[PDB]
Amino acid sequence: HMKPGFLYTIGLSNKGMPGLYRLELQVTKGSGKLATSGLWNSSSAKEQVKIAFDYFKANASRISKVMEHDFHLHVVELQNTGPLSHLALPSLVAFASGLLGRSVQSQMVVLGDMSLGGSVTPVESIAECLQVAFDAGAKKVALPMSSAADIPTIPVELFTKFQTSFYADPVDAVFKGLGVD
């Protein structure tokens, strides 16, 4: 499929516009250092990626040691929408994919986000995000469980275009994005 540590995500930009982004995480031999690029000089994006990396360090046993590798997360803005406001959960998925050397499911977009407390949050404007996902050729989507309540907000022609999986927590999100749960 795709290179491990690479994944597509779709989310509302800082200006409220749905956009498609590609996370490109590189893993090397190191000490556990997180470097970032493409974060638009945004302290908010950096803090989100940091929350993701902290959760990664704290729960990497449930998925191997991050302290023996160095990570560089580049973020590619594919549709000129600005900074992505929902980066924690996609970054966690990209971190775990990079570590385990497992590729994210082919033609899948990961949607949703993660709070500091470690709970997943429903996709913001899921109808618009999935419209972007369909227009971008995505075939599968991984969604937070709560977003099921928003299924009736999505036009049925659009929602039934996807093969959809649901995750209950960040680790479950990792397993759904890699294709093993």
Residue numbers in the entry: 496 to 558, 562 to 679
What does the original paper state about this entry?
To better understand how BrxL’s C-terminal domain relates to those or other protein domains (and to provide a starting model of that domain for subsequent CryoEM studies of the full-length protein) we expressed, purified, and crystallized BrxLC. During the final step of purification by size exclusion chromatography (SEC), we observed that BrxLC eluted at a retention volume consistent with a monomer rather than as a higher order multimers (eventually shown to correspond to hexamers) previously observed in studies of LonPC and RadAC. We obtained crystals and solved the X-ray structure to 2.25 Å resolution. The crystal structure contains 4 subunits in the asymmetric unit, with no obvious higher order symmetry. The backbone atoms of BrxLC superpose well with both domains despite low amino acid sequence identity (BrxLC shares 14% identity with both domains); superposition of BrxLC with RadC generates an RMSD value for 148 structurally equivalent α-carbons of 2.3 Å (P-value 8.97 × 10−14); superposition with LonPC generates an RMSD value for 172 structurally equivalent α-carbons of 3.3 Å (P-value 3.02 × 10−12). A structure-based sequence alignment of the BrxLC with RadAC or LonPC does not demonstrate obvious conservation with previously visualized DNA binding residues with RadAC or with a protease catalytic motif as observed in LonPC. BrxLC’s distinct solution and assembly behaviors, in conjunction with the low sequence conservation relative to LonPC and RadAC, indicate that the BrxLC domain may have adopted a distinct structural role in the function of BrxL as compared to the same domain in LonP or RadA. In contrast, purified BrxLC is monomeric in solution and (in the context of full-length BrxL) appears to mediate dimerization of heptameric (without ATP) or hexameric (with ATP) complexes through protein-protein interactions with another BrxLC partner. In the DNA-bound dodecameric complex, BrxLc domains are far removed from dsDNA occupying the central pore and do not share significant conservation with LonP residues essential for protease activity or with RadA residues involved in DNA binding. These observations imply that BrxL’s CTD has evolved a distinct functional role from the LonPC and RadAC domains.
Bacteriophage exclusion (‘BREX’) systems are multi-protein complexes encoded by a variety of bacteria and archaea that restrict phage by an unknown mechanism. The final gene in most type 1 BREX systems, termed ‘BrxL’, encodes a large protein (670–700 residues in various species), with much of its sequence predicted to adopt a fold corresponding to the chambered ATP-dependent AAA+ protein family, which are involved in a wide variety of cellular functions throughout all biological kingdoms. In this study we have demonstrated that the BrxL phage restriction factor is a multimeric DNA binding protein that displays ATP-dependent assembly on double stranded DNA.
